[PDB]
Amino acid sequence: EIDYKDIATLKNYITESGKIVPSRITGTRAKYQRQLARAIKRARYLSLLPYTDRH
Amino acid sequence: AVVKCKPTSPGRRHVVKVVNPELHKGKPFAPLLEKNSKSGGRNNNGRITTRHIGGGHKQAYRIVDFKRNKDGIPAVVERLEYDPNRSANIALVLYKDGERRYILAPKGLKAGDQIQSGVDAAIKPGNTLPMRNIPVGSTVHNVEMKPGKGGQLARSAGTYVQIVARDGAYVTLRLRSGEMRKVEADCRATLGEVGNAEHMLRVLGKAGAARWRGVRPTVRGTAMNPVDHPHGGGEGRNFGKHPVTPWGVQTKGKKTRSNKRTDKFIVRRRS
Amino acid sequence: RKQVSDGVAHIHASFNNTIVTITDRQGNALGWATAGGSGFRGSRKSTPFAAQVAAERCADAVKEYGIKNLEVMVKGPGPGRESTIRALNAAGFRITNITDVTPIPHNGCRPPKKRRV
Amino acid sequence: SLSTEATAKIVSEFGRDANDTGSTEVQVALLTAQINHLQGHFAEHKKDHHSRRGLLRMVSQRRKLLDYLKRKDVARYTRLIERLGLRR
Amino acid sequence: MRHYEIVFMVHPDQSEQVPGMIERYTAAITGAEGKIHRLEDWGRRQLAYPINKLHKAHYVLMNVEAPQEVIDELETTFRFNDAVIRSMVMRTKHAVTEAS
Amino acid sequence: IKVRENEPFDVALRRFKRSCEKAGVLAEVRRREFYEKPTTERKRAKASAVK
RNA sequence: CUUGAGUCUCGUAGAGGGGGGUAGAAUUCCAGGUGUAGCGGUGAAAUGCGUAGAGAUCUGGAGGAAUACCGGUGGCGAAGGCGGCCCCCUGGACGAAGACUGACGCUCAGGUGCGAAAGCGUGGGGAGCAAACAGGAUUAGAUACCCUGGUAGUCCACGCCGUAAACGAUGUCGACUUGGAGGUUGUGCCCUUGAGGCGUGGCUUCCGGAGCUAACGCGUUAAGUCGACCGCCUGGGGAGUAC
RNA sequence: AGGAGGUAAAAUUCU
RNA sequence: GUUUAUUAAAAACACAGCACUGUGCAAACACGAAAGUGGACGUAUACGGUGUGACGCCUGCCCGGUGCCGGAAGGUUAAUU
Ligand SMILES: [Mg+2]
Ligand SMILES: [Mg+2]
Ligand SMILES: [Mg+2]
Ligand SMILES: [Mg+2]
Ligand SMILES: [Mg+2]
Ligand SMILES: [Mg+2]
Ligand SMILES: [Mg+2]
Ligand SMILES: [Mg+2]
Ligand SMILES: [Mg+2]
Ligand SMILES: [Mg+2]
Ligand SMILES: [Mg+2]
Ligand SMILES: [Mg+2]
Ligand SMILES: [Mg+2]
Ligand SMILES: [Mg+2]
Ligand SMILES: [Mg+2]
Ligand SMILES: [Mg+2]
Ligand SMILES: [Mg+2]
Ligand SMILES: [Mg+2]
Ligand SMILES: [Mg+2]
Ligand SMILES: [Mg+2]
Ligand SMILES: [Mg+2]
Ligand SMILES: [Mg+2]
Ligand SMILES: [Mg+2]
Structure with a gap:
């Protein structure tokens, strides 16, 4: 959001297979649903949270 | 240019x-x-x-x-x-x-x-170490075959070997001849690719270009008479022969490597 | 053989002929038996039933080396997906864990054009 | 579009005071100033077609309003191009 | 002078090259009068997934103000150091000082 | 995907089996190309999925 | 003269464009470990792959191309068209206050430039896919549709080419006429008094009045009402052909 | 009660 | 450009360019019973061989035969025992 290191949260926006969550389910604001992706996806790049869930 | x-x-x-x-x-x-x-x-x-x-x-x-x-x-x-x-x-x-x-x-x-050499001696293009001291994958030229015996491998313009393993006391390396081949790893090598790789883009353009380069007309085996070469004579542009060196051996396909003393160093050979 | 008792079963349901093998935990391997040259061959493979029986002939030769359990990760779409495990837990191996391993790209390579039956 | 600071300089001498930001003298000066620096951007890159499209607007507009004054207050132009650079 | 957020990470068996870095970066950004407004360091940390087949690796952070430079010749100092394993330098968005 | 579920029974479990992926994203990524007809899939899967 | 128009100011969102960087999943291949007679493929087959050991599985390593989820009658661009992440360069649009300018405009034959894919040149690149080509089927035939392969090409660089159902088949600008659901991005005011209360901008999707229409349909983003300027049509063929 | 995935193969002609 | 000195100067040979192929260096290859030497004080952007013959548009089908490059299961086989 205002932060991506918020790995604290986020985890309430990504499934038990490691998938980002549709904005129709999570029901989040649009302008800020993007701000989530460019920040969850930011954070999976430096392995604080995974892409997959099998390795 | x-x-x-x-x-x-x-x-x-x-x-x-x-x-x-x-x-x-x-x-x-x-x-x-x-x-x-x-x-x-x-x-x-x-x-x-x-x-x-x-x-x-x-x-x-x-x-x-x-x-x-x-x-x-x-x-x-x-x-x-x-x-x-x-x-x-x-x-x-x-x-x-x-x-x-x-x-x-x-x-x-x-x-x-600046450049230099030695068992440390930085690690930029122009610097020479034993390969027991160059990272694997590193791109190199002027490779030694036996240590102290000067560079022999990959010296031609724009040429290079990349090291590609370590396997112990040798160090497998691939030469863009296509062949991978173990070699004693105290053998030195210089960082970088060599020379103006532009070389091969020349065209020469006339005969004399080649003459003053040292090289001299090559005469076909059918341009000759059958006493001169096995591509025989003719009677007006003829062949019907299995291609061959003037001395009788097949050209095209006829593998002619013999050296078992080094077959212990080739690992994968060019294709 | 040497008897572990703790192993795993790798199952591949390609569709067209659907296959299953078993290995040890770190993933060595010891037994195919598979729907193809084994109870027909042709459209009467690639059937769920054939996966059942494909699991059985596996079972009936994957014993020894202990095994009395197994992790069971599974590769495929279509028939034989479940019906193997359905027969596996019936032959008396304690179904420890199951897993997805069907390869999903992040769209990576072109797939093959033009096919209307 | 250059720096928010920049252009601060160029409104003087061209303009009668700061925040006299609308005399045809300044925009022309603002344009040229960008264009000139901005020709560097198209040295490198150069296959950046789209960015160029914006450029020519600057050039079109510049020239369009450099022609406007030619009709009003003669030699209010011949006191600025040489003051700047461009009459090719 | 615009702000950047930096967050590199270097492999386990050379964590303790820690401060050896930071200082020269301060010499590199004090030498370009740009106050960093919050530092952090948090070594031992496990990974979402292995890398080069290795779990765990040392981390850091920043939010430095600096010239649209140094990051030129710094973002490239992560282009030697076979030592360091990953990086990221971020946008800006005003200053930074709390989260963690 | 990776499932463990606790304790006594045998049922392969999960009315959430078609969890996130398999059956579906494998059809798509498998069949073949597209480019023009995911645009037709678009103005149909939500030209109809209006009301 | 300031209201059309532009300039300055602080910001906004954006897959706008160009450069360099890096990640992650899969396909293919290289080397091994275990492992044994089948794999693959179809409507059914067979070609092909496998007893030097395939397919399955594990570990490791190459290399190329594309960015799952976000993703959505979502945004962006003049159009073509643009989707992982990261910094550098740069374009445009929009909002708000006020400041300057003082008609600086609109349109545009000529002219200039941009312009999907295939295609061309020089080289480099080549994992997948796949014109051509080959083999397996299919069939009366099968130069096809289906299957095993497969080169150009698809990728990069620099220079060509300049065409698409390049379409909304709807030229650009401005002004004027009931409405309903929204989507999305700003911003002014009022107990943060909510994820607000009350407004006001730009874009945008569906429905629909009047009116228009040959009808289909269009319907404030018009095909309604007007005006400026440009392009174009005058029966089917011949022909977007010949010179 | 939503989604999902799989269900028709080839087969010409009529002053 | 070269060539039948002394009946043939040509459309013949050479040519730059193209391709096939062999060569990892004690290279292939050649001269040498050998030693040695050339290749080369070069190192696959190199060197040898064969065919083609600037450039442009291009270079189709055929691996049965003869060659050459791979093979192993056997069948057949040398000296030898
Ligand atoms: Mg020649
Ligand atoms: Mg020759
Ligand atoms: Mg003759
Ligand atoms: Mg003879
Ligand atoms: Mg003849
Ligand atoms: Mg692997
Ligand atoms: Mg890779
Ligand atoms: Mg901007
Ligand atoms: Mg162009
Ligand atoms: Mg193209
Ligand atoms: Mg090309
Ligand atoms: Mg046309
Ligand atoms: Mg279009
Ligand atoms: Mg309507
Ligand atoms: Mg309306
Ligand atoms: Mg109108
Ligand atoms: Mg014509
Ligand atoms: Mg019919
Ligand atoms: Mg007839
Ligand atoms: Mg002459
Ligand atoms: Mg004579
Ligand atoms: Mg030669
Ligand atoms: Mg000839």
Whole structure:
């Protein structure tokens, strides 16, 4: 959001297979649903949270 | 730089030069060169052992350092020079003790670049270590086959070996001949790719280009009579023969490697 | 053989003929038996039933080396997906864990054009 | 579009005071100033077609309003191009 | 002078090259009068997934103000150091000082 | 995907079996190319999925 | 003269364009470990792959191309068209206050430039896919549709080419006429008094009045009402052909 | 009660 | 450009360019019973061999035969025992 290191949260926006969550389910604001992706996806790049869930 | 030159005259028309604008214009460094007389491709016996060879320009030997044995001591690239004796270009270097040498110039360097050699001696283009001290994957040229025996592998213009394993006391390496081949790993090697890789973009363009390069007309085996070559005679443009060297052996396909003493060093051979 | 008792079953349901093998935990391997040259061959493979029986002939030769359990990761779409495990837990191996391993790209390579039956 | 600071300089001498930001003298000056620096951007890159499209607007507009004054207050132009650079 | 957020990470068996870095970066950004407004360091940390087949690796952070430079010749100092394993330099968005 | 579920029974479990992926994203990524007809899939899967 | 128009100011969102960087999943291949007679493929087959050991599985290593989820009658661009992440360069649009300018405009034959894919040149690159080509089927035939392969090419660089159902088949600008659901991005005011209360901008999707229409349909983003200027049509063919 | 995935193969002609 | 010195100067040979193929260096290859030597004080952007013959548009089908490059299961086989 205002932060991506918020790995604290986020985890309430990504499934038990490691998938980002549709904005129709999570029901989040649009302008800020993007701000989530460019920040969850930011954070999976430096392995604080995974892409997959099998390795 | 490659140039196409205009059709001022045929056999200029197809020409294509390689023009290197920071190759030192003028006379090479005297004390590092010695005479070098041509052969015609004729051996001590007097016979033509290799043919197509002879005639074409005079050519003084530059003594390049293929060993790079003087470790420590920085050396500075004073200038880049043309070399007749090979496609590659050389670099007159000045070791900080006053000694001077020639080295196969790699893709990188220019005037003023520092270089050196030794069991540490940095790790940039122009620097020489034992391969027991170069990262795997590292790109290298002027490779040694037996340590202390100077560089033999990948010396031609724009040429290179990449090291590609370590396997213990040898060090498997692949030569863009396509062949991977273990080698004793105390064997040295210089960082970088070599020489103006632009070399192969030349076109020559006329016959005389080749003549003054040393090389000499090649005459077909069917242009001849059957006493001259096994591609026989004719009676008007004829063949019907399994292609062959003048001495009888098949050309095309006929593998002719024999050396089992080294077959223990080849691991995957070119294709 | 040497008897572990703790192993795993790798199952590949390609569709067209559907296959299953078994290995040890770090993933060595010891037994195919598979729907193809084994109870027909042709459209009467690639059937769920054939996966059942494909699991059985596996079972009936994947014993020894202990095994009395197994992790069971599974590769495929279509028939034989479940019906193997359905017969595996019936032959009496304690179904420890199951897993997806069907390869999903992040769209990576072109797939093959033009096919209307 | 250059720096928010920049252009601060160029409104003087061209303009009668700061925040006199609308005399045809300044925009022209603002344009040229960008264009000139901005020709560097198209040295490198150069296959950046789209960015160029914006450029020519600057050039079109510049020229369009450099022609406007030619009709009003003669030699209010011949006191600025040489003051700047361009009449090719 | 615009702000950047930096967050590199270097492999386990050379964590303790820690401060050896930071200082020269301060010499590199004090030498370009740009106050960093919050530093952090948090070594031992496990990974979402292995890398080069290795779990765990040392981390850091920043939010430095600096010239649109140094990051030129710094973002490239992560282009030697076979030592360091990953990086990221971020946008800006005003200053930074709390989260963690 | 990776499933463990606790304790006593045998049922392969999960009315959430078609969890996130398999059956579906494998059809798509498998069949073949597209480019023009995911645009037709678009103005149909939500030209109809209006009301 | 300031209201059309532009300039300055602080910001906004954006897959706008160009450069360099890096991640992650899969396909293919290289080397091994275990492992044994089948794999693959179809409507059914067979070609092909496998007893030097395939397919399955594990570990390791190459290399190329594309960015799952976000993703959506979502945004962005003049159009073509643009989707992982990261910094550098840069374009445009929009909002708000006020400041300057003072008609600086609109349109545009000529002219200039941009312009999907395939295609061309020089080289480099090549994992997948796949014109051509080959083999397996299919069939009366099968130069096809289906299957095993497969080169150009698809990728990069630099220079060509300049066409698409390049379409909304709807030229650009401005002004004027009931409405309903939204989507999305700003911003002014009022107990943060909510994820607000009350407004006001730009874009945008569906429905629909009047009116228009040959009808289909269009319907404030017009095909309604007007005006400026440009391009174009005058029966089917011949022909977007010949010179 | 939503989504998902799989269900028709080839087969010409009529002053 | 070269060539039948002394009846043939040509459309013949050479040519730059193209391709096939062999060569990891004690290279292939050649001259040498050998030693040694050329190749080369070069190192696959190299060197040898064969065919083609600037350039432009291009270079189709055929591996049964003869060659050459791979093979192993066997069948057949040398000296030898
Ligand atoms: Mg030749
Ligand atoms: Mg020849
Ligand atoms: Mg003759
Ligand atoms: Mg003879
Ligand atoms: Mg004849
Ligand atoms: Mg692997
Ligand atoms: Mg890779
Ligand atoms: Mg901008
Ligand atoms: Mg263009
Ligand atoms: Mg193209
Ligand atoms: Mg091309
Ligand atoms: Mg047209
Ligand atoms: Mg279109
Ligand atoms: Mg409507
Ligand atoms: Mg309305
Ligand atoms: Mg209208
Ligand atoms: Mg025409
Ligand atoms: Mg019919
Ligand atoms: Mg008939
Ligand atoms: Mg002549
Ligand atoms: Mg004569
Ligand atoms: Mg040759
Ligand atoms: Mg000829």
